[PDB]
Amino acid sequence: HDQLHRYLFENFAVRGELVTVSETLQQILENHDYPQPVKNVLAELLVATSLLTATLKFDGDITVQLQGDGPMNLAVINGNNNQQMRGVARVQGEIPENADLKTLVGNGYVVITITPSEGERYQGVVGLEGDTLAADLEDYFMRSEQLPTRLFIRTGDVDGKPAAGGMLLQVMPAQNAQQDDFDHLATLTETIKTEELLTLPANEVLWRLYHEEEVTVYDPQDVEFKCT
Amino acid sequence: HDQLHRYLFENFAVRGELVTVSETLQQILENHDYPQPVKNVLAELLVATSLLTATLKFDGDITVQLQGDGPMNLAVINGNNNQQMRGVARVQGEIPENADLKTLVGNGYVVITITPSEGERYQGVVGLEGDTLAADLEDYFMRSEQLPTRLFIRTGDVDGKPAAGGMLLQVMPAQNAQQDDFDHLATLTETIKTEELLTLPANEVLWRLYHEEEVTVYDPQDVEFKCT
């Protein structure tokens, strides 16, 4: 049985995800005489995608794909908030046995595209400077997410049949930051008169805005023009 | 004086940023007979970029640009961890007075590109389904960031000279989630034997891994193939 389990480290404020594919991976590979190397990355993408799927805070579908000039020019996996997966790979050449991710995909990128059920599509890209899909994905989050995140992907065979699983670790956003409060602050600052903001000293705008709240201000930083 | 002030709402775990440009904006506009409408979006991008700049957790430069088919096919602003800004705009046609963002930029996108000082470049894209740059940017974060985020951008003139300012609100990541602890958990799960993960029931992998920690597991979710 393919299932995704969500778990929380109560004392450390770190959410976790554990998942396994076999049933789903089987259905995605049957009737595609994919060589072994291709079947392996698809296993990894299926795990990666399924885990990323469970982090959505809204309803829509996410797809994680690899693109490159190597023999496997395309490998993609798509899932939705309901954990329904599907995908394909495109082999355009000679695929050597025991081929590593970096050779199957030549020079390319990982492309995360998040298209919601009502809204406009988002797409993130990062090159494949990695020996591991999980390493590349972690690189992606390091550049696009404040919350530290870790990924673990395992691939192998069980009963001659291919199987894969993985886990994800990610820091939680502060508890104290209840939407109710955040929305209040956000509604509070939107009352900032543009003339008010552009003429008064910073410390004044601050208290004129948040005199009711407990606020800590740190040292200012000079913003300047980068002239040649 | 152009400065970026960082502040924290102690009780609510919400970091804030307040910034103003005038000196820097002046230097970026002089010797470019940009019409007014173009000067306005550049003001917004300069505020937006400077704020985003201050969220970097590593050293490198970020650039926020608009691209489209309208009269202003390109508008970009680039900054680094040290808050050094620079940018340009490309006008390729008739730019109507009192032109709104949606007309200056025809049909295009917002393109955030984060290239660090050692590492590989990242790039995020989202279409301009917005009447406001801040609305589009917020849309971007909603799809790429777990931490709720809000942006406020104000543009106007002070002493006949152009000026702009803005503020950003963003939930903080849990305090409890000290890197030391997170790294421990991350090192803990990486000891998961692939055969262990792919053959044992979930609840067993969990305790066989985190029996020392206080963990809460929620209802599992079925992961399946999306057949037509």
Curated annotation (Swiss-Prot), chains A, B:
Induction: By heat shock.
Keyword Chaperone listed: yes
Transmembrane segments: none
A Gene Ontology term for the protein's cellular component: cytosol
Keyword set, alphabetical order: Chaperone, Cytoplasm, Disulfide bond, Redox-active center, Stress response, Zinc
Gene Ontology terms describing biological process: maintenance of unfolded protein; protein refolding; response to heat; response to oxidative stress
Modification after translation, per record: Under oxidizing conditions two disulfide bonds are formed involving the reactive cysteines. Under reducing conditions zinc is bound to the reactive cysteines and the protein is inactive.
Subcellular location as annotated: Cytoplasm
Gene Ontology MF, one: unfolded protein binding
Chief place where the protein resides: cytoplasm
Family the entry assigns: Belongs to the HSP33 family.
Function: Redox regulated molecular chaperone. Protects both thermally unfolding and oxidatively damaged proteins from irreversible aggregation. Plays an important role in the bacterial defense system toward oxidative stress.
The name this protein goes by in its record: 33 kDa chaperonin
Biological source species: Escherichia coli (strain K12)
Gene label: hslO
Whole-protein residues included: 4 to 231 of 292
